[PDB]
RNA sequence: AGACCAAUGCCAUGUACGUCGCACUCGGAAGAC
RNA sequence: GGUGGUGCAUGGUUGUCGUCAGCUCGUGUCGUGAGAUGUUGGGUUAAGUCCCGCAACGAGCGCAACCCUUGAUCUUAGUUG
RNA sequence: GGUACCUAACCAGAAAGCCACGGCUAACUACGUGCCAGCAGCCGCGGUAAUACGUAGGUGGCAAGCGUUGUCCGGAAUUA
């Protein structure tokens, strides 16, 4: 077992490269559920936003994730996306 | 008189040639590749790169082409007047078509022609086929355009004296 | 021929045997144990990867360990699926077995995860240009030191098989003193059979 | 069905409506969905100018006598092209709205008429004559598919007129802007056909 | 500047080409002492 | 299930030249291009080993070293020697 | 010549084919065959995994026409 990590709830994704960062959101997955977290958010850019439609086609194959969705009203709005797990 | 790379432009492959060498171990296979860039209306170069593979090849010949440029001139989108290429039996011939032509080219003579975005020219290969022969006898000619101002200048004289 | 292979010579100078234990008059069977032991773990753990197992027999109770950063999801909610595999494992090998995972820092300049990797989009259907040249420029922006790989089969041209490469930096096979790391996995389409290896440097043992 | 084939074949949807490429936009064939070659410098343009064959539906040898009359035509060599098309009649019916494809178009001049500066047209040459009165009874008048047409709004352009009661409208005087060009990649036919 | 060597059976030999990066909200009452 | 063929479909393997000192690349020049220069010249070495020159400047696989053993000795530990 | 024209009613029913798909040159796969049968304007393909033979599908180009052949001019600045 490992036991020397702690790991965020949130990730900020914003101004960096597609397949540089799919090879470790795909790591941040791992670690939330190492520590059991239900709910998790990548948050991300707007201006290209290919990587902003193209990290959630890979959360729907997943083999972990059940969803990904956009915030709420109260949450403030698309300034978070969320994900949640099996 | 050299144009730097602050503006944006545009680039078009027209040829991969492939090349060989001979070794004690064998044949040895190499890329060549030219392409031709410029602006749609006064600038326009052209590059050539060596290299094992397309990409790195393209990318040779790329920096060659943000290296070189010359620039045309340009009287009413279309050539001013005659003008035939010359650079080691590739012939060129150019002539100041009328407006609403079109471009009326072979393949590489429309391809650095269309990147040079002149709208009405029509031309003609009188001398060798080859591409690369082609392209440094067209930029051989239309380095040697002249505008009318500066004639006039040289003349001592005006542009009305000169147009009629 | 080819070359022989980095690790192989560097085997009992810098590397591991990752079989630690010592056997006498058991060794046979014990040997045998450790080989179908490991092909459990690695047709069963194909999914999340797994690079290298270290086998302990400390008072003849097996005891394992396990690399790679991706079963942090086998850590995780899966400690049911630690405790069913564990179960299997005391299944096979009589008297029984523990377990731990091992996590990887930067996995991606593990030999044996990159040639899985590499295997994956061929199998995909993804250029080998393309496969072989991200792959690369990912490992020396990881921090690796020098990084040849290799692909071999029938690469689209089925009529005749060729081979392809690409490398920088520096890759000293020759110099004993050089960490080496190197994998071979087979990529499987349906031309036939694709080859894939990979060996990366690391710098040198001081 | 031409038109969803054709669609896929040729990358845009022909009717200018956004479907027939909602889910195949590759291609038709066994071979359609994988990545293809960029077109060569005879095939892209021999594409276009099917996009400008098939969304009139018009054939070949027709295609290279108008292309003569636009040439012979005093203005610029491609433009007077378009616009000839533009005023090919079925586009008229077209872009006056009662005519839903092309198809209908041809069909429905086979069966009505226009009798603006005319008897009874079945043949889409002419032009409207600019400061006549002849106007469309009966067998264009009358009828079901009559109403059908101008049950809803579809746009009738600047250079065209039209009222939606008796359904007729005429040429207006000069064509410019959108007529002269709605997306359509053109000098590909002249450069094409000056081959 | 220094002797003598003749021949090597029809085809067919390869590949090449193909990336894409940028995000967080606006504002009531309040005395004199 | 095929030791039923196809190394001229193949992966993985191995020999061979040859333990020969060669093999190449980035960038830049010259040619137009094929290509060249680096890698040639002087000297030197088992070695593209090294030095000095030189439109080249560098880099890599190479070579050498790093490993094992055998040669001389110090310290530790003296048993089943 | 009761022709064309002009009207009415019946039936979406009576009516699309040819050639090409290695490149030049738009369009790819399956099976059979295995220097055989064969294709071909040029370069050429086929000696058991043939996108070039022969089939089938699919695609492409044109259409009451489509391919082949012959002849003339261009391309041919190849009599300049």
Do not use: C
Request: glycine content about 10%; charged content about 30%.
């Amino acid at each position: 077992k490992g036991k020397d990590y702690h790991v965020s709830l949130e990730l900020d994704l914003r101004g960096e490269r597609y397949e540089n960062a799919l090879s470790r959101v795909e790591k941040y997955l791992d670690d939330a559920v190492l520590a059991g977290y239900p709910r998790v958010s990548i948050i991300h850019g707007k201006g290209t936003g290919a990587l902003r439609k193209g990290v959630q086609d890979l959360l729907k194959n997943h083999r972990s994730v059940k969803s990904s969705r956009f915030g709420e009203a109260g949450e403030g709005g698309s300034g978070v996306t969320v994900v949640e797990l099996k | 008189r050299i144009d730097p790379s602050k503006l944006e432009l545009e680039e078009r492959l027209v040829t991969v040639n492939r090349v060989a060498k001979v070794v004690k171990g064998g044949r040895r296979f190499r890329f060549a590749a030219l392409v031709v860039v410029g602006d749609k209306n006064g600038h326009v170069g052209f590059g050539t790169g060596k290299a094992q593979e397309v990409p790195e090849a393209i990318r040779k010949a790329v920096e060659d082409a943000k290296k070189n440029l010359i620039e045309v001139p340009m009287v009413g989108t279309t050539i001013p007047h005659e003008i035939i290429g010359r650079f080691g039996a590739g012939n060129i011939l150019l002539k100041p078509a009328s407006e609403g032509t079109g471009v009326i080219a072979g393949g590489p003579v429309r391809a650095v022609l269309e990147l040079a975005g002149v709208a009405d020219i029509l031309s003609k290969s009188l001398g060798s086929n080859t591409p690369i022969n082609m392209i440094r006898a067209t930029l051989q000619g239309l380095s040697e355009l002249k505008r009318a101002e500066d004639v006039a200048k040289l003349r001592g004289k005006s542009v009305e004296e000169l147009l009629g | 021929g080819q070359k022989v292979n980095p690790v192989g010579l560097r085997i009992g100078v810098i590397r591991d045997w990752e079989s630690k234990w010592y056997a006498g008059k058991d060794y046979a069977d014990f040997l045998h144990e450790d080989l179908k032991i490991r092909e459990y773990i690695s047709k069963r753990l194909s999914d999340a990867s797994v690079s290298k197992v270290e086998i302990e027999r400390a008072a003849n109770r097996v005891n394992i360990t396990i690399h790679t950063a991706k079963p942090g999801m086998v850590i995780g909610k899966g400690g049911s699926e630690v405790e069913a595999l564990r179960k299997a494992l005391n299944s096979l090998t009589g008297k029984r077995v523990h377990i731990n995972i091992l996590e990887i820092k930067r996995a991606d300049l593990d030999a044996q995860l990159v040639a899985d990797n590499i295997a994956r989009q061929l199998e995909n259907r993804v250029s080998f240009r393309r496969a072989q040249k991200q792959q690369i420029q990912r490992t020396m922006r990881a921090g690796a030191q020098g990084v040849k790989t290799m692909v071999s089969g029938r690469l689209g041209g089925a009529d005749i098989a060729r081979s392809e490469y690409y490398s920088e930096g520096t890759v000293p096979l020759h110099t004993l003193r050089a960490d080496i790391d190197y994998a071979t996995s087979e990529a499987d389409t349906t031309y036939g059979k694709l080859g894939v290896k990979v060996w990366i440097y690391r710098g040198e043992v001081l | 069905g031409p038109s969803w084939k054709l669609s896929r074949r040729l990358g845009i949807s022909l009717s200018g409506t956004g479907k027939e490429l909602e889910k195949r936009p590759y291609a038709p064939g066994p071979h359609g969905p994988g990545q293809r070659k960029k077109l060569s410098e005879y095939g892209l343009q021999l594409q276009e100018k099917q996009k400008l064959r098939h969304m009139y539906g018009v054939n070949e040898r027709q295609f290279r006598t108008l292309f003569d009359k636009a040439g012979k035509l005093a203005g610029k060599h491609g433009e007077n092209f378009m616009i000839l098309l533009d005023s090919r009649l079925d586009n008229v019916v077209y872009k006056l709205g009662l005519a839903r494809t092309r198809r209908q178009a041809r069909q429905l001049v086979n069966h009505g008429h226009i009798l603006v500066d005319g008897s009874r047209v079945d043949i889409p040459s002419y032009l409207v004559k600019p400061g006549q009165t002849i106007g469309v009874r009966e067998k264009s008048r009358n009828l079901s598919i009559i109403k059908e047409s101008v049950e809803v709004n579809n746009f009738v352009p600047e250079y065209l007129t039209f009222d939606a009661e008796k359904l007729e409208g005429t040429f207006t005087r000069l064509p410019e802007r959108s007529e002269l060009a709605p997306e359509i990649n053109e000098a590909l036919i002249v450069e094409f056909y000056s081959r």
